[PDB]
Amino acid sequence: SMATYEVLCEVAEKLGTDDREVVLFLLNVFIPQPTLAQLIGALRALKEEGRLTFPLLAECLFRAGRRDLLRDLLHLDPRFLERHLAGTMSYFSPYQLTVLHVDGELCARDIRSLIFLSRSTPQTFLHWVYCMENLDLLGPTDVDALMSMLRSLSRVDLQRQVQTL
Numbered sequence: 001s002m003a004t005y006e007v008l009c010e011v012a013e014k015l016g017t018d019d020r021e022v023v024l025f026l027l028n029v030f031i032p033q034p035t036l037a038q039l040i041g042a043l044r045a046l047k048e049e050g051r052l053t054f055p056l057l058a059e060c061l062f063r064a065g066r067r068d069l070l071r072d073l074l075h076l077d078p079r080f081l082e083r084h085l086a087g088t089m090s091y092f093s094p095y096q097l098t099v100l101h102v103d104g105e106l107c108a109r110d111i112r113s114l115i116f117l118s119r120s121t122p123q124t125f126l127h128w129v130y131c132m133e134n135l136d137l138l139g140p141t142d143v144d145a146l147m148s149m150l151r152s153l154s155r156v157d158l159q160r161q162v163q164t165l
Contacts, residue, residue, distance in 0.1 A: 001054035003047050010073050011057070012039045015066075022064045022100065025126050026092055027056075032127045056091050063092065063100065095140035098165040099129055102146070102158060110153055117153065 013036070015023065020039055024030040029042045046052035058076060061069050062085065067078040090097070103125045106114075114128060115121055121128040129146075132138030137145040143162065150159050 003052040003054050003057045005044070005047060007073055008043050008047060008052070008057075009040060011061070011069065012036060012043065014069060014072075015039065019064060019066065021124060021126050022103070023060060025130075026060050026063060026096060026100070027052075030126070030130055032124060032130060033122065059085060059091050063097070093140055094165050095143070098143075098162060099126070099146075101165075102150075102162065105155070105158055110155060113153060114149070117149070 020034050021030075021032070024034065024039070024042060027042070027046060029046060031038050031042060034042075043052065054074075058070065058074055058081060061067070061074075062078065062081055070076045070078040070081060106125055111123070111125060114125065115123070118128065119131065121131055129138055132145055147159060147162060150156070150162065
């Protein structure tokens with residue numbers, strides 16, 4: 001299965017300011033605070049270098065939290081895809097899935113404190129994680145740079161799920 005170029009444009013229009021950052025992270029190619037041109041520009045490069053398969057995008061929208069779109073553009077049943085991607089193995093790494101979950105369990109007070117504690121990561125948790133990818137501090141092998149930043153913030157309860165995944 002493969003992601004159609006025409007469908008890819010319809011997904012980029014219906015993606016909000018905050019959703020953009022999440023999708024790009026799950027697809028590996030990430031650009032912080034992206035415009036419509038920047039979002040389609042990365043998507044076109046994945047569907048041109050064969051990487052953008054149909055179930056990679058179907059799962060990408062199911063994991064991002066946009067279950068409305070599966071039945072809108074992809075014409076899939078999100079209830080069947082939910083029951084399907086449970087027994088089926090996930091396209092994404094448990095490191096990509098952990099970062100996305102840690103993102104959701106963060107508060108506005110913590111996200112501002114994140115910046116003042118640590119280019120200089122403009123108002124994004126995924127933007128800070130992207131810095132560590134280039135600065136060799138966060139990776140699927142090493143997540144202790146995040147564990148220290150979690151303990152030294154307030155969310156000490158998130159270190160248990162992180163230590164697992």
